[PDB]
Amino acid sequence: MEVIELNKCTSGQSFEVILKPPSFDGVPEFNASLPRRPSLEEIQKKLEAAEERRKYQEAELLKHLAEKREHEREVIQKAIEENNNFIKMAKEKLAQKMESNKENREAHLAAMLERLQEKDKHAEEVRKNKELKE
């Protein structure tokens, strides 16, 4: 059975009941590893290359967005452009149809007036044919 007394102090005492010894000749080696990672202050620069990714994502989806943003500015613009752009057409094809009207009637007029004018250089040029028979 035996104990084995390990220290004696102002406020305590220790020991050991070793009860039956192991079945030993030492043994294992379970991640008690011969290359096993003593680590390194240099890998603050591992903390950085993670935060250069954030600065990324932000800056390239604030890019995938001032992108959107500045299409908007061009839609509301292609609508001041749609409108402005049809005033200038059916506003102008208005008066264009109106020179075709004052001009065409200018004809069917002074060309109706034309007949009734050599009906007249005939009244008076065959009254100077009154000077014929008599």
Binding site: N83, F86, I87, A90, K91, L94
Partner: peptide
């Protein structure tokens, strides 16, 4: 109506 549209687009 022609003219109107020219003067009041929207």
């Amino acid at each position: 109506m022609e003219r109107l549209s020219v003067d009041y687009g929207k």
